[PDB]
From a paper:
Bacteriophage E217 infects Pseudomonas aeruginosa and is part of an experimental phage cocktail developed to eradicate P. aeruginosa infections in Galleria mellonella (wax moth) larvae and vertebrate models. E217 is a PB1-like Myoviridae of the Pbunavirus genus characterized by a ~66.2 kbp genome, significantly smaller than the classical enterobacteria phage T4 (~169 kbp). Here, we describe the structure of the whole E217 virion before and after DNA ejection at 3.1 Å and 4.5 Å resolution, respectively, determined using cryogenic electron microscopy (cryo-EM). We identify and build de novo structures for 19 unique E217 gene products, resolve the tail genome-ejection machine in both extended and contracted states, and decipher the complete architecture of the baseplate formed by 66 polypeptide chains.
We determined cryo-EM reconstructions of the extended and contracted E217 sheath at 3.1 Å resolution (FSC = 0.143). At the quaternary structure level, the extended conformation of the E217 sheath consists of a helical tube of ~205 Å in diameter that has a regular pitch of 490 Å and rise and twist of 40.8 Å and 31.3°, respectively. The extended sheath is porous, with visible openings between subunits. The internal lumen is ~75 Å and houses the tail tube (described in the next section). Stacked hexamers of the tail tube protein gp32 form the central tube of the E217 tail. Six copies of gp32 assemble laterally to form a hollow hexamer, whose internal lumen measures ~40 Å in diameter. The interface between gp32 subunits is stabilized by 11 hydrogen bonds, many of which form between residues exposed by the extended β-turn. The interior surface of the tube is mildly charged, with two charged patches, one positive, exposed by Arg125/Lys127, and the other negative, formed by Asp27. Before genome ejection, each tail tube subunit contacts one sheath protein generating an extensive interaction surface stabilized by two hydrogen bonds, one salt bridge, and 99 van der Waals contacts. Notably, tail sheath subunits do not contact each other in the extended tail but are solely connected by the association of their C-terminal β-turns and N-/C-terminal arms.
Numbering used by the authors:
A (entry chain E), C (entry chain C), D (entry chain B), E (entry chain D), F (entry chain A), G (entry chain T): 1 to 144
B (entry chain F): 1 to 504
The structure:
């Protein structure tokens, strides 16, 4: 319930910004399953195992018209590829503060997905914003 | 140094094969030779064993040499034979069970204080017998015989003791003939012939006084002793027509279990066919009156014994087999036509492209329309019955109980299935044979279920099982039984070829 | 609720036309998610990232018999490919005015999808019209 | 509600026939979406667009035992290929009259799909007849 | 409701048999849609059409334990391929008599699909039998 | 309702065992449809047909903790492939006794599929066991 | 109900740890079906069968914040591939104790799947942790 996310960017947001509106029916702070190894079985029952390589992925849904959503849109537009626009190559960092301690920090990452313009649903309400991310290193400081 | 055969042993020059690898029917010969005791059956795995046991001059060795020397269309050999005794005439009581090779003349030193005890109707003993000289086993037998003669007992008054060199049997024949029982017991006297002679040690055969018995009754006792045979015959002089008819009727009493092969002349062939008409399981083979015996009656027996029903392709026809030892019987078309009316088998000679060919011309068994006329189908039925019975007995022996319900039926069908698979593999079962209206009606009548004829046409066989209740004759108690019905098709074979050559 | 779209065409509609009937149970002004980057993880855990190239996509559903629908059909028929018909190569522009400011403008674009003739549903009513579009440049002048 | 279709064939039905039974729970007079153009985005954000080529497609569902259905079956059987049957290569035309004017005319076309024999559903009723079509040129004369 | 099917076989059932139990919740006498032609559109809007070749297909569901089902099973087992069994190559014919006339006849055909043994469903009842077929020629004598 | 299955194995269970617990909501004694022939239609309407080759398939679901299930597990473990374990090559046979006669017998077969260990479902109950099989020859001896 | 799992690791947890929180609506201790053999049918009905090679697979779901879940996360993080982290190659073992005896032991195995960070669902609860595994040898000592 008392969950916040602080986003930092090396160039666009050197001091960082905070987001607190996590939206209603979508899943905030979602992470797909992580595959770490693969196996094979040879003839006569011998088993061999090797390690696969993968990285952490995270996606956060937000309210269509909020300060955090606007900052996220600014970041995505800054990094986006377009006809005639400068592309600022910056690395993003994420720290998630959960209730009862449990801080989680991701160091090196980049924006991947987003929605450029607002869309209206059939019922007549604005739709939410996916804003996918991926990161390289994750450290947990929430033993308490 | 150690002999080095303690670790690695290699034998060279023999190369004996595996004794048994499948199920095979074997020949049984009923002989009147006095060597074989009446109450036992003896099986020989090789011709040399017959030669050693009976001797070179005996007709049994002559039969065995021809029987073991046979190669079928596939490379197979009989590899087994058995003999039984027929009591042609009245016999005095005898005691012989001595197979141990004890005749190494180790009888000296037993001369002092011989006290042999004989347990007859009334027990009587023998005084000290002096065998110290031991010049020969015949002389030892004579000395024993004299001390038997010393007794005033009617059995021992004119008793005789003989010896046979090829075997190692000591025989005593009672003086009275027709009735009597003779036996001996092992005494505690150290100088006793109970251990010195073979009697009263391990297996000893005791035969009582017996009157002459008919061959039909004679074969029944042999079957009771053992029934591990197929296609039996009678050796020696040919039997009378009435005796042959009686044996044929006895064989027909059994349901598709053995084959009876008899040898007859051309003159007697027409007469026998009238008497033995019907009576399935009887084979007639024509004998040549201008040459030796040649043992033509053994021709179907060898073919039957060569078959191995565990291997695929076992089933085979009987109408083309060449026997180099045998001689020619008929050579004319009219004689062959007359013989074929009597359902007689023979060896016929013919010439093709300058080459003379002689082969077993026919494979017909005498019997009724309901019975299996051909030999191959008869043999296949024999094997099938044996296999089914063995499987059912094994199922009974290896289970706690077989409930009188659907579970018992399922168990019995499951047990029988592999035997049916083996039957299909052998060649007993054939598929795809067209079914006529009469056969369709008969099948629907035998099995209440319709559309079973469709299955016997397509796959080739049909089987079902039910259970019921009954009461046995010995006691009034009620018991439960099971019934099953099996329908299958008989295969066809090509035996005649006709063609036409047209030039333009 | 007070949403309006103005369409301009370089040749067919030099002065432009407006559409206000956004239809009932379909989704008006829909936009699929935008992919901006892709990543790969090498052996030993190294991560590499590159930028993907994509453009904005928008689709608007309209009432079967309205002036805006007729103008959209005219545009699609003008740009369509057919047996014997002239093809007018024109670039379309779209500006969307939402309630409380927030104007969004798309400059260079073209039609992609449409439905040639009206279709009746099982219930007995006329069916709606998809009218898909794609655009190159988007600028957001709705900071207020 | 007051909708009719007049079908004409060059050889089988030179004078044409009319169908009015459009059936209940199926979709009569259905048309799939039409694709008109395709796009691609190169490196550095350049956008290129080209025209795709497609034709109009229409499908009409009818009641199993009616005069229009029987005529449609006759047409399909005439044009169909088979073991030993003549094949009449004929071009079909369709005009659709909707309530309040709005005539739609299709010129060159051919039958494509159908069901050879009647089928009964689980409930115990005869099943519906799809009768798919495709056409080359479409003209709209329903400005009123 | 009063529907029957008469099946004939050249070898197995020279005089034919009749089936009347069409089973409850499965679809009896079902036929998939038939494709008769294909089209392509070239550059500049030219349209080309060609005829595809197909045959009629029919499937009939029956009660698990009935005379017609048993005859169908007999036919399928007769034509089936197996380890050691004769295969009777026979052509099947089907005539369908519907209420109010409308006879439909199929001449040359063969069994294709079936289920070898009876299966029990979860509820505890025996399951249905598909018994698919295909035919070459179809003639309709049901103008009345 | 009164359905039983007797399983026999050539080596592991020479005398066979019986199974009577067929489990609740799964389908016991299930068999997929059998394909027997394939067809092709050439140009000008000629039809060609050939026979396909397939074998009978059967699957039976059982209660997690019963004697029949334990025997089935023993059979599957005996025939299974593993690191260091002997593999007994045995052919299995199945006879099914249904109410009102109708015995069905399958001669040559082998286990195909299974589940090694028990699994607990979400509700808190043990899960069922599939135990798939395949067979070569089938004979029906209970048409009565 | 009274089910426990004891996990042992070659290097990370030489003495092992126990997990008892098997979580509510997910499936704990799940195992996919195990394929043991494959078959083929040649022309004329001959059947051939060969053995396939596979290994046991198990997955256990746990409550997001518990001692067992934390130990499982520690075990997964040790073997994982990452930018700059040591990889401890250790073999894991699992023994499962069910109510009424029936112990099941797996000897050689390795972690495969997991979720790196906690995720929150739409309703506002923490999400579940899959923690997949695979093993080589399985022995059953639960005849009682």
């Amino acid at each position: 319930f008392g969950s916040i996310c602080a986003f930092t960017a090396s160039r666009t947001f050197p001091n960082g910004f905070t987001v607190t509106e996590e939206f209603a029916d979508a899943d905030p702070i979602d992470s797909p399953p992580f595959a770490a190894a693969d196996t094979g079985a040879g003839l006569n029952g011998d088993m061999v195992v090797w390690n696969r390589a993968n990285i952490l992925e995270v996606v956060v849904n937000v309210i269509p018209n909020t300060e955090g959503e606007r900052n996220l849109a600014v970041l995505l537009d800054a990094n986006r590829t377009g006809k005639d626009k400068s592309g600022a190559r910056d690395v993003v960092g994420l720290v998630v503060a959960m209730p009862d301690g449990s801080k989680i920090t991701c160091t090196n990452g980049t924006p991947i997905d987003g929605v450029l313009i607002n869309a209206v649903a059939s019922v007549g309400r604005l739709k939410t914003k996916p804003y996918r991310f991926r990161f390289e290193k994750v450290i947990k400081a929430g033993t308490s | 140094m150690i002999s080095q055969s303690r670790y690695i042993r290699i034998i060279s020059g023999v190369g004996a094969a595996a004794p048994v690898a499948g199920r095979k029917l074997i020949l049984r010969v009923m002989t009147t030779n006095n060597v074989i005791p009446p109450g036992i059956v003896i099986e020989f795995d090789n011709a040399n064993a017959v030669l050693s046991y009976f001797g070179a001059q005996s007709e049994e060795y002559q039969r065995a040499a021809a029987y073991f020397k046979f190669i079928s269309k596939s490379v197979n050999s009989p590899s087994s034979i058995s003999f039984a005794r027929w009591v042609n005439t009245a016999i005095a009581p005898m005691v012989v069970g001595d197979n141990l090779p004890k005749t190494i003349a180790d009888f000296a030193g037993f001369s002092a204080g011989v006290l042999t005890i004989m347990v007859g109707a009334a027990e009587q003993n023998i005084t000290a017998i002096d065998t110290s000289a031991a010049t020969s086993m015949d002389n030892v037998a004579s000395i024993i015989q004299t001390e038997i003669r010393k007794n005033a007992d009617p059995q021992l008054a004119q008793a005789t003791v003989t010896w046979n060199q090829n075997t190692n049997q000591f025989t005593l024949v009672g003086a009275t003939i027709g009735t009597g029982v003779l036996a001996v017991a092992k005494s505690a006297d150290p100088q006793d012939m109970s251990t010195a002679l073979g009697w009263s040690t391990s297996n000893v055969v005791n035969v009582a006084g017996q009157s002459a018995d008919l061959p039909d009754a004679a074969v029944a006792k042999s079957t009771n002793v053992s029934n591990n045979f197929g296609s039996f015959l009678f050796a020696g002089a040919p039997l009378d027509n009435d005796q042959i008819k009686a044996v044929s009727a006895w064989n027909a009493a059994q349901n598709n279990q053995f084959i009876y092969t008899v040898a007859t002349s051309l003159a007697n062939l027409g007469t026998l066919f009238t008497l033995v008409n019907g009576n399935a399981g009887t084979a007639l083979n024509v004998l040549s009156a201008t040459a030796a015996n040649d043992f033509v009656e053994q021709c179907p027996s060898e073919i039957l014994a060569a078959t191995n029903y565990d291997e695929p392709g076992a089933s085979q026809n009987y109408m083309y087999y060449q026997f180099p030892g045998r001689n020619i019987t008929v050579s004319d078309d009219t004689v062959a036509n007359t013989v074929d009316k009597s359902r007689g088998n023979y060896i016929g000679v013919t010439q093709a492209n300058g080459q003379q060919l002689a082969f077993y011309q026919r494979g017909i068994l005498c019997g009724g329309p309901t019975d299996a006329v051909d030999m191959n189908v008869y043999a296949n039925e024999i094997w099938l019955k044996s296999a089914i019975a063995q499987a059912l007995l094994d199922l009974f022996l290896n289970v706690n109980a077989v409930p009188a319900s659907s579970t018992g039926e399922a168990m019995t069908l499951a047990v029988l299935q592999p035997v049916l698979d083996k039957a299909t593999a052998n060649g007993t079962f054939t598929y795809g044979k067209e079914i006529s209206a009469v056969q369709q009606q008969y099948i629907t009548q035998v099995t209440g279920d319709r559309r079973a004829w469709r299955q016997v046409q397509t796959l080739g066989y049909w089987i079902n099982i039910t259970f019921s209740s009954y009461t046995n004759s010995n006691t009034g108690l009620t018991e439960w039984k099971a019934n099953y019905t099996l329908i299958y098709s008989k295969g066809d074979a090509i035996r005649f070829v006709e063609g036409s050559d047209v030039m333009i």
